[PDB]
Design a protein around this ligand. Structure first.
Ligand SMILES: O=P(O)(O)C(O)(Cc1cccc(-c2cccc(NS(=O)(=O)c3ccc4ccccc4c3)c2)c1)P(=O)(O)O
Ligand SMILES: O=P(O)(O)C(O)(Cc1cccc(-c2cccc(NS(=O)(=O)c3ccc4ccccc4c3)c2)c1)P(=O)(O)O
Ligand SMILES: O=P(O)(O)C(O)(Cc1cccc(-c2cccc(NS(=O)(=O)c3ccc4ccccc4c3)c2)c1)P(=O)(O)O
Lengths: 208, 213
């Protein structure tokens, strides 16, 4: 649409600092952070973004899925969930199945996600195909590896936002950001609101 | 303590026009800015400097000409030179020059200067993946033995200090498929200064940005 941005990824940071400046404990910053997440999700949905990928950075989802479904949002959980107990994982997949048919915003939430791991699990899949006498090491190119990293079915990440002041990727997406616009703001996550998100989108629109 | 700096050199052509001169003038000033960044890195204890020329046969002979004229001086300055990237299709004479220039300076112990030539971050990761696919196909590697540490041993520069800081001049705010795996934890510094103008003062500012942060 107008801003030209189809997929936005956000490294959410700053809740702790935000609460501390208030003189409140971490829990307070967490409640504020979740409010800021709903706000960013509403904003993305109301603005034609096809996909929003969120990453909670730490210098250290069952109630929501319904409101999500009710808002026609499609939900996916990216990250190494292979170790969680089998209950969670089902609970995760249920939430996923449940919204797979929604046509609005596709929301990706990182849980135990790493860009290096993401690349490695994809490598493992190709390795498995090798061991099966189906794939020749020399047939493996970029495109093929690309079909195996998280979110390869969605539009490429156009813009990555990191709030909170740090200027680093911190092992969030790596393969996927090869061409993304990188936008860093000192604003703390709890205070990152619609006008901040719009500012980031207009920065992307005028930059490209 | 910044040990390995990587720079996305951008802005020469745009610089050219602001002067109202041709692209060749910008290239000329860009090469001078390269010598100055390399000199500066070596004078200030930086362990590795990795350079990537961003662009929107000739250059092949230019590469050969550059290596032929500058290696002797890198050598005297105790700099170890490495080219990173797919040089598999460069003509054989340039391939041989690159090999000899690397061989000649391989034992130097000062600054390691990595010049990216036809390099891409994705290609780089895929090159590593192909190597592992071989070991797997042979039966010496199990698909689930493959891990981050293992993959890392097969990406460019894995023998060097980890990239601490990535500088991109020229105004754009993207990695443009330069280093990807290697920048997982690096500080990313963007400046609108055009490459020909990037000098000792701009370089230090980036280093400070790293120090304070
Ligand atoms: O901002 P910080 O780094 O100071 C901190 O609040 C961690 C944090 C960073 C960014 C956002 C949030 C935040 C708090 C609560 C909810 C949300 N997002 S969320 O509801 O989708 C969610 C929260 C935490 C998660 C942890 C691991 C996987 C998925 C998560 C999803 C964001 C918390 P902290 O715990 O390290 O003080
Ligand atoms: O609620 P609406 O439809 O009235 C509106 O907010 C638009 C809107 C569109 C799509 C979704 C939402 C929405 C509102 C509030 C919260 C949410 N999602 S959320 O922030 O609670 C959330 C989503 C996924 C999560 C996964 C794991 C942990 C926490 C999560 C929180 C979605 C709102 P609006 O701007 O039209 O008034
Ligand atoms: O900046 P741009 O994108 O406007 C453009 O100049 C392309 C460009 C981008 C970045 C750097 C350069 C540039 C051009 C030519 C050479 C150099 N560096 S270099 O290859 O001469 C080099 C420098 C020092 C070396 C020392 C020892 C061995 C090899 C060396 C090679 C940089 C050009 P353009 O032609 O696409 O407009």
């Amino acid at each position: 649409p107008a801003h030209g941005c189809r997929h936005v990824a956000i490294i959410m940071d700053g809740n702790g600092r935000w609460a501390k400046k208030q003189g409140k404990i971490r829990a307070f910053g967490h409640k504020a952070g979740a409010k800021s997440v709903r706000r960013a999700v509403s904003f993305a949905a109301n603005n034609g973004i096809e996909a929003l990928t969120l990453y909670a950075f730490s210098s250290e989802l069952d109630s929501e899925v319904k409101s999500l479904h009710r808002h026609n949002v499609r939900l996916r959980i990216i990250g190494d969930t292979s170790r969680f107990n089998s209950r969670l994982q089902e609970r995760i997949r249920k939430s996923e199945a449940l919204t797979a048919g929604n046509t609005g915003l596709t929301l990706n939430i990182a849980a135990n996600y790493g860009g290096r791991w993401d690349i490695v699990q994809g490598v493992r899949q190709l390795a498995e195909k090798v061991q099966q006498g189906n794939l020749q090491p020399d047939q493996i190119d970029e495109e093929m590896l690309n079909q195996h990293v998280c979110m390869h079915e969605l539009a490429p990440v156009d813009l990555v936002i990191r709030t909170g002041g740090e200027h680093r990727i911190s092992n969030f997406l790596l393969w996927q950001i090869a061409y993304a616009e990188l936008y860093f703001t000192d604003v703390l996550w709890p205070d990152f609101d619609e006008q901040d998100f719009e500012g980031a989108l207009n920065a992307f629109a005028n930059r490209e």
